[PDB]
């Protein structure tokens, strides 16, 4: 029984989830997504 509980605790520890949340939040803050600016943009492209 204690062997099984230790095993399950080990897998659950390997099955944590908050770290990916933290990583995604950090990446979102770093990239600094935004929409404010002009209504629409006109750009230069040399279409093939």
């Amino acid at each position: 029984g204690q062997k099984l509980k230790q095993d399950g605790d080990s897998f659950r520890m390997k099955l944590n989830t908050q770290e990916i949340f933290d990583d995604w939040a950090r990446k979102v803050q770093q990239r600094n997504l935004g929409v404010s600016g002009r209504i629409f943009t006109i750009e230069s492209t040399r279409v093939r």
Binding site: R38, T41, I42, S44
Partner: peptide, 28 residues
């Protein structure tokens, strides 16, 4: 004095209008 139709509706090709408005966006 039979009147003739005046200047027709112009096209003002998309490229020129886009360039003018790109300039206006750049200056604003």
């Amino acid at each position: 004095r039979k009147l003739v139709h005046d200047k027709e509706l112009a096209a003002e090709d998309e490229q020129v209008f886009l360039m003018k408005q790109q300039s206006l966006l750049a200056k604003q």
